Design a binder for this molecule. Structure first.
Ligand SMILES: [Ca+2]
Ligand SMILES: [Ca+2]
Ligand SMILES: [Ca+2]
Ligand SMILES: [Ca+2]
Length: 224
């Protein structure tokens, strides 16, 4: 039986897409740039802060010094970190809270493998910290997804082998990081985005303890 489940945060437990979009829009109006609307926001999602700020600059071909650039990126981040004060347990995606309870009560290790420096805060906003045995610190991990280190550190932090672990992710880079760590990925999303090879469910309500056991047992049979 698997001994740990390794959770990404964004797109598995919740998302904060409205908060990012609000923060980006506030930043762009402050610097008198227009055209950061919802369709344009689709380009910012999941992208690094620096690349998103560059996309917003190119809307006006505005050029800035490196200190201004760093200042603008921090301004958006400070504003977003203030906005996620309002995250609450009602933001947890369907199926997730019950899955965490079932793992905890089954004594299966639960770890967070998220790139976000806001992971601890967001889990506390959602009243989930009690379920998480460890949170891999993204600052301590030099190589980010699709490199497997964040997931390797997550498995180690709870004292299980990655090969004893299932990883949950909604992004291709995360699915690849889970693969390369040796844990077993179960994607949530579409195979057009995540690949035709892994086990995939369309939405998080499929993430049940019973379904993960089905995927695990079926992986153990594959030998052979
Ligand atoms: Ca993700
Ligand atoms: Ca999504
Ligand atoms: Ca909840
Ligand atoms: Ca709380």
């Amino acid at each position: 039986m698997f001994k740990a489940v390794l959770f990404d945060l964004d797109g598995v437990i919740t998302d904060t897409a409205e908060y990012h979009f609000r923060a980006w829009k506030a930043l762009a109006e402050e610097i008198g740039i227009n055209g950061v609307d919802r369709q344009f926001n689709e380009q910012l999602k999941g992208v690094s802060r620096e690349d998103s700020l560059q996309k917003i600059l190119d809307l006006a071909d505005k050029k800035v010094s490196a200190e201004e650039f760093k200042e603008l990126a921090k301004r958006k981040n400070d504003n977003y970190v203030k906005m996620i004060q309002d995250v609450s347990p009602a933001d947890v995606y369907p199926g997730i809270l019950q899955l965490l309870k079932d793992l905890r009560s089954n004594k299966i290790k639960i770890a967070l493998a998220s790139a976000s420096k806001n992971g601890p805060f967001l889990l506390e906003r959602m009243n989930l910290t009690g379920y998480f045995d460890a949170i891999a610190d993204p600052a301590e991990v030099a190589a980010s997804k699709p490199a497997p280190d964040i997931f390797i550190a997550a498995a180690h932090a709870v004292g299980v082998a990655p090969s004893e672990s299932i990883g949950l992710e909604d992004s291709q880079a995360g699915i690849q990081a889970i693969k390369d760590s040796g844990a077993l990925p179960i994607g949530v999303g579409r195979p057009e985005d995540l690949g035709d090879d892994i086990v995939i469910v369309p939405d998080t309500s499929h993430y049940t303890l019973e379904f993960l056991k089905e995927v695990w047992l079926q992986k153990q049979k594959h030998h052979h």
